[PDB]
Amino acid sequence: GVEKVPKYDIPTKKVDYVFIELDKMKPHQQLVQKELEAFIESVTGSGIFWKPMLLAKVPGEDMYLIVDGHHRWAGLQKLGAKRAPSVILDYFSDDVKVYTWYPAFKGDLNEVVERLKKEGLEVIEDPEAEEKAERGEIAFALVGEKSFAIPGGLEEQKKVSKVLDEMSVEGKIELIYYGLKEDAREDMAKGEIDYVFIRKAPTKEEVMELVKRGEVYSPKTTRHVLPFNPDKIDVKLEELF
Numbered sequence: 001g002v003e004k005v006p007k008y009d010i011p012t013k014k015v016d017y018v019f020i021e022l023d024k025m026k027p028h029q030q031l032v033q034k035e036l037e038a039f040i041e042s043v044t045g046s047g048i049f050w051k052p053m054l055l056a057k058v059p060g061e062d063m064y065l066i067v068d069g070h071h072r073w074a075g076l077q078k079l080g081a082k083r084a085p086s087v088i089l090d091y092f093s094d095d096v097k098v099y100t101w102y103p104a105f106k107g108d109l110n111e112v113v114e115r116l117k118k119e120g121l122e123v124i125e126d127p128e129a130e131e132k133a134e135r136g137e138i139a140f141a142l143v144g145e146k147s148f149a150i151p152g153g154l155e156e157q158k159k160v161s162k163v164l165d166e167m168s169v170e171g172k173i174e175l176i177y178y179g180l181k182e183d184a185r186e187d188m189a190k191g192e193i194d195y196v197f198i199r200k201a202p203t204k205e206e207v208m209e210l211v212k213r214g215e216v217y218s219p220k221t222t223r224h225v226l227p228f229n230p231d232k233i234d235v236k237l238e239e240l241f
């Protein structure tokens with residue numbers, strides 16, 4: 001998929017799954033086309049669904065927040081499936097932490113900047129962009145050899161993400177999402193990427209607040225962390241109808 005594999009593999013736990021209906025699941029963020037496509041081709045080609053979704057009960061509603069699994073959920077719905085193997089978490093437990101994913105690309109800076117500006121964004125050379133972004137003062141810092149601030153907030157984060165999605169689909173860039181900006185910097189030094197987009201992470205209270213208002217974030221805004229990753233499961237795609 002589109003995400004960089006973590007450098008350190010956290011413990012696994014055989015937590016087992018429960019089937020939950022896809023129509024009881026509530027997204028909190030947008031999709032990346034290449035992530036959706038890769039999931040659909042993997043599950044249909046292999047015939048096996050091997051990673052359970054992460055869910056949490058929405059306060060006041062007979063619905064589950066999609067904690068992790070937007071592309072699995074959208075892809076399964078598109079395929080015509082009914083349900084997905086899921087793990088129901090306690091969202092406000094201290095054993096659910098949240099960080100973010102940083103969009104990054106291998107490709108031409110000037111082409112990306114041109115496309116961002118055509119979308120109506122400002123891209124301002126600014127040596128303090130990274131720390132402004134970490135403080136949540138701008139939508140993203142675009143950082144590599146050079147440093148740019150992209151002013152704004154949620155709407156601007158969506159416009160940035162849309163441009164990257166389109167350029168990825170067009171083949172103009174390789175789009176990769178990093179859990180840790182230091183990993184992006186390390187890969188930048190190896191020539192594996194050119195630029196990373198830095199943003200402040202959301203809080204769990206902000207995520208549920210946004211979900212309750214019926215809004216969504218730009219893709220990969222939340223990176224939820226548990227004390228483990230669930231072990232692989234072995235569920236036939238046909239069992240999901």
Ligand SMILES: Nc1ncnc2c1ncn2[C@@H]1O[C@H](COP(=O)(O)O)[C@@H](O)[C@H]1O
Pocket residue numbers: 001035038039042043046048049050051068069070071072073
């Ligand atoms: N055959 C498969 N069964 C279940 N999950 C998969 C499969 N192939 C890829 N994935 C995962 O699907 C996820 C796509 O993003 P998301 O569903 O939004 O978390 C990634 O975590 C992939 O590791």
Ligand SMILES: [Mg+2]
Pocket residue numbers: 068069070
């Ligand atoms: Mg995911």
